[PDB]
Amino acid sequence: SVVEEHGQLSISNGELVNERGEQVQLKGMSSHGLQWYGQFVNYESMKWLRDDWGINVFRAAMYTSSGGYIDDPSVKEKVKEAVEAAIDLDIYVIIDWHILSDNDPNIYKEEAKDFFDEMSELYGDYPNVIYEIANEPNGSDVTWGNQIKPYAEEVIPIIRNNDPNNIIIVGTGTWSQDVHHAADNQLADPNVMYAFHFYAGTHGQNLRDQVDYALDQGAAIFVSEWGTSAATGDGGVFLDEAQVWIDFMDERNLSWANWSLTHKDESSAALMPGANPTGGWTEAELSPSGTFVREKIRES
Numbered sequence: 001s002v003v004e005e006h007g008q009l010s011i012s013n014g015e016l017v018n019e020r021g022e023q024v025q026l027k028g029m030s031s032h033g034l035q036w037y038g039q040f041v042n043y044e045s046m047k048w049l050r051d052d053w054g055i056n057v058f059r060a061a062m063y064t065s066s067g068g069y070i071d072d073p074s075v076k077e078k079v080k081e082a083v084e085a086a087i088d089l090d091i092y093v094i095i096d097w098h099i100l101s102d103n104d105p106n107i108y109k110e111e112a113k114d115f116f117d118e119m120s121e122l123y124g125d126y127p128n129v130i131y132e133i134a135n136e137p138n139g140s141d142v143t144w145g146n147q148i149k150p151y152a153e154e155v156i157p158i159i160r161n162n163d164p165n166n167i168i169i170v171g172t173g174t175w176s177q178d179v180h181h182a183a184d185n186q187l188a189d190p191n192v193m194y195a196f197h198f199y200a201g202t203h204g205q206n207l208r209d210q211v212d213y214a215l216d217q218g219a220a221i222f223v224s225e226w227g228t229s230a231a232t233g234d235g236g237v238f239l240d241e242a243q244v245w246i247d248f249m250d251e252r253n254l255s256w257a258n259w260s261l262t263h264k265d266e267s268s269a270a271l272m273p274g275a276n277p278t279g280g281w282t283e284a285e286l287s288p289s290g291t292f293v294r295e296k297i298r299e300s
């Protein structure tokens, strides 16, 4: 129903809109690393998230390093499983080239270009797909102008040769927080968005003001990852600040995916140890984070 109704997504005046020009807000879940917690990514779990939580997007977080794709490329097949499930379930899907320790997206740029060539060749005639080409550029030696923008200007053409207008999300500096610099030096492609990531354990008032600055330059922002935890993915749950961010995102038409769908013993994990990898979770099988996130999506 979601993808049939909204169809082709695009950016209009810095906003994500559907094929009839109406603003649309995506809200869903990210997997954790597919090399570690891939069992939670399947048609049945995604159907349960769609039906019971109300998700309309799913993010497939394919780590490149940390035992991910570069080390063992078999994980690309799990991305394919996820995309196919989203197509079957009529929801949107984010294909995330999930850089992190490999902090400069240029490190694996050749591999990224080949990967996105393949993905866009396979799926480029479906409206479900959103390409996230570099999760979290980070480090003082990785800047928008010198590293990230030129990387994007190599990878985007590869995608566009197969898929001329599905959305592409481009990571920003400082673990996808530096939307200010991106917004002042935007990419040419009209269907690009810049990633912004937050963790509720960080006091967020200036970060919200920076997102507003970026929006005011006409840049579109996708909150492609956020957590209820501290920035590590752990360290307690911060639901008061998470709610402030939720309300902020609603007011600003910002789409989002929550980190993450796993049973790992960390505060950001949505599931308890014991949760069935194919869905059907009772309230006792959701963590405090998962309970909150599910409520936010159901409310929406």
Ligand SMILES: OC[C@H]1O[C@@H](O[C@H]2[C@H](O)CNO[C@@H]2CO)[C@H](O)[C@@H](O)[C@@H]1O
Pocket (backbone or CB within 6 Å): 066, 100, 136, 197, 225, 231, 232, 233, 234, 259, 264, 266, 268
């Ligand atoms: O892989 C290191 C670490 O990653 C955390 O997840 C991060 C994600 O990869 C990028 N955005 O920030 C989040 C939080 O730091 C996981 O939560 C950890 O379990 C994992 O060890």
